């Protein structure tokens, strides 16, 4: 049971290293707030 | 390096003016940022 827990934690290291997709739920929140700010700043360029 | 009310060729603005490393080409007087606002300028008397 210890060896299975130790092995499974070893796969968590490998997964979080191997793919950029892993933290997508956090990166999506950084990206939407960055997009919303970048859009807000671009509206200063608009003539109205 | 002091905050000033600048007016270069009628581009009236405000801010601190600093020496740029930006390599403008001969034909360009003003530089803009991502935000579509003038963030660099060629001085019209001494071309830095």
């Amino acid at each position: 049971i210890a060896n299975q827990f130790n092995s499974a934690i070893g796969k968590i290291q490998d997964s979080l290293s191997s793919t950029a997709s892993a933290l997508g739920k956090l990166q999506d929140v950084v990206n939407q707030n960055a997009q919303a700010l970048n859009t807000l700043v671009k509206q200063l360029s608009s003539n109205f | 390096n002091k905050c000033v009310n600048f007016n270069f060729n009628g581009l009236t603005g405000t801010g601190v003016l600093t020496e740029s490393n930006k390599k403008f080409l001969p034909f360009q007087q003003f530089g803009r940022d991502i935000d579509d606002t003038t963030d660099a300028v060629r001085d019209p008397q001494t071309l830095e």
Binding site: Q27, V30, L37, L44 | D39
Partner: peptide, 23 residues
């Protein structure tokens, strides 16, 4: 996971990343 003329400013969170690591 990855001043400007617009008048924006991002404030820091009350707890640093060290304080969240300690909790």
């Amino acid at each position: 996971v990855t001043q400007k003329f617009n008048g924006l400013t991002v404030l820091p969170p009350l707890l640093t990343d060290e304080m969240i690591a300690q909790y």
